[PDB]
Design a binder for this molecule. Structure first.
Ligand SMILES: [Ca+2]
Ligand SMILES: [Ca+2]
Lengths: 272, 272
C-alpha cells in the first residue's frame, strides 16, 4: 500500500495543478442529470488522467470514478484494491470560482479504506492519512476538536443536489431541528471532502449529509478517523460507504446526538 | 481621507496579528444576549486598542464599535467623521478555530462610507476600497461576476443569530424559495464581511441577510460597490446602514429578483 499511496500523492498534486490553471480560464459548462448537476471538460479530463496513470502502474486494480459511472460504468465495491476518485469535488464552486475545490483519491482493500488523499487546490493544502499512521495537512499532524456538548458545537452540511420540494423541505426541516437545540451555528463551503477536512482539523465539530456518493467521502473519511474522529450512518448504525449517508464527527457523543435529531431521506444507493 | 485610510490599513494588520496569535490559544467564551451571541476577551481587547490608536491620531472623530455599544455606548451616525468598527467579525468561527475571521473598519463622513478595510486574518488577505478608486485584495483589482440569470447564481447567506421558532422558520422559508427557483447553491462561511468580500471577487453572485448590524457591513459594503456591485435593502428600497438588512449583489437584476422572493422579518434598528 505505501508505494500506491506516494504515487497517489504525486498524482493528486499534479491533477490539482491542472484544476488550478483551469479555474481562471473560460469553461465549457455542461449538464449531467438536471440544470444544477454540472460537469465541465476539466472534470472529465482529470478523471481520465488519474485512471490511465493508475492503470499503467497497477493493471489489476478496480476503479470507481464519478465521470466513469456517468459514462455507464458501475459502482459495486469488491475486495479488489479499488481506487475511488472524484476529480473535482466542488464542481459548482469551480464553475463560479468560489475558492474551495478538491481532488479526492480514496483507496480500499477488502472493502475497507486504507488511505486517503484530498488536495484543496486554491488553498494549496494536501491532506493525507493512512490507517494506523495519523492524518496530516502539508506535514502537520491533525486532531479533531474536544467538544462533547451539542449546544456548543459548530456543524457543517450542504443543502444537496435535489430541488424536489419534498426532499428540500426534509433537508431544511433537519437543519431546523439542529439549529434550535441550539447549536452555535451551521456552515457550508460547498464540497463534502473540504467539509470533512475542516472537521479533521478541529475547525468544525461535525459534518452530516444525505445524498453524497462514495467518491465524495472515500478519501476524507479516513482523514477524519485518523485525526481521531468518528464515522457513522444517520440511523446511528455503522457507516456504509455506498448508502449515501454519513455523519463524520469529532467523537461518538455528538454523532449519536445528531443521528437522534435528524430524519432519514429516501435515496437510491450507489450499489443499486 | 487618504492618510486616515493608510493608517487604518496599518491598524487592521496589527489588530489582525493580535487575533491570529489569540486563535491558537484556549479561550474563555462569554455570552452577551443569548447563548449563541458570543464574545471573548480578544474582541474587547482588539476593540479598545483600535479606538485608542485612532483617538490618539484623530480626537475629533466619532466611533461606532460593537463591544462599545454592548458597554452602553450609542450607535448614532451623524455627518461627523465616524469610524465604524467590528474587532472580530466571526467570533463564533474564532472560538472554534473555523478559519474565516475578519477585522472590519468602515469610515463615514456625512453619513456615506468613504473607505473600508476588511482583513481576513487566518488567510492573510487584506481587502480595501476607497470611493471612486476601486476595490483591491492584496494589491489585485477586484470585479464582480457578470451573471444576470438567477437560475445560474451562487448565493451566500447566514442562518442568523436568532433561534426563536418563528424567525428561524422565516429564514429557512426564505431560503427554500430561492433554492427552488433553482439557483446553483447557497454557501455560509460564518461572517458577513467575508461573505460580502467573496461577492466582490466574483466568487459568489449575491449575499443577502437580515439581523446584521452596521458594524458587520460598513467596511465590506464599499468593497462590493467599488468592485462593480450594488447594495440594496431586502425590500428593494435604498441600502440603509442602520436597518439591519442588506442585499450586496453583482448587479441590480439579481438584487431585485432576490428582493422579490424573500419576505422581511421585523427588526429593531441600530439607531433606536
Ligand atoms: Ca465531482
Ligand atoms: Ca464582532
Amino acid at each position: 500500500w505505501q508505494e500506491c499511496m506516494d504515487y497517489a500523492v504525486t498524482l493528486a498534486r499534479q491533477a490539482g495543478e491542472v484544476v488550478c490553471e483551469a479555474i481562471k480560464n473560460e469553461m465549457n459548462v455542461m449538464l449531467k442529470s438536471s440544470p444544477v448537476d454540472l460537469v465541465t471538460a476539466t472534470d472529465q479530463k482529470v478523471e481520465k488522467m488519474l485512471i490511465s496513470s493508475i492503470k499503467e502502474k497497477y493493471p489489476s486494480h478496480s476503479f470507481i470514478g464519478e465521470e466513469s459511472v456517468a459514462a455507464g460504468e458501475k459502482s459495486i465495491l469488491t475486495d479488489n484494491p479499488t481506487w475511488i476518485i472524484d476529480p473535482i469535488d466542488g464542481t459548482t464552486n469551480f464553475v463560479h470560482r468560489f475558492p474551495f475545490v478538491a481532488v479526492s483519491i480514496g483507496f480500499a482493500v477488502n472493502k475497507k479504506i486504507e488511505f486517503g488523499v484530498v488536495y484543496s487546490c486554491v488553498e494549496g493544502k494536501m491532506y493525507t492519512a493512512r490507517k494506523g499512521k495519523g492524518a496530516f495537512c502539508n506535514g502537520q499532524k491533525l486532531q479533531v476538536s474536544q467538544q462533547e456538548d451539542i449546544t456548543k458545537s459548530l456543524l457543517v452540511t450542504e443543502l444537496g443536489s435535489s430541488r424536489t420540494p419534498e426532499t428540500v423541505r426534509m433537508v431544511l426541516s433537519n437543519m431546523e431541528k439542529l439549529f434550535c437545540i441550539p447549536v452555535h451555528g451551521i456552515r457550508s463551503v460547498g464540497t463534502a471532502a473540504v467539509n470533512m477536512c475542516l472537521v479533521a482539523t478541529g475547525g468544525a465539530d461535525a459534518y452530516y449529509e444525505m445524498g453524497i456518493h462514495c467518491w465524495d467521502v472515500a478519501g476524507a473519511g479516513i482523514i477524519v478517523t485518523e485525526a481521531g474522529g468518528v464515522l457513522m450512518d444517520v440511523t446511528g448504525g455503522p457507516f456504509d460507504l455506498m448508502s449515501r449517508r454519513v455523519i463524520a464527527a469529532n467523537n461518538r457523543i455528538l454523532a449519536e446526538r445528531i443521528a437522534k435529531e435528524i430524519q432519514v431521506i429516501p435515496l437510491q444507493r450507489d450499489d443499486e
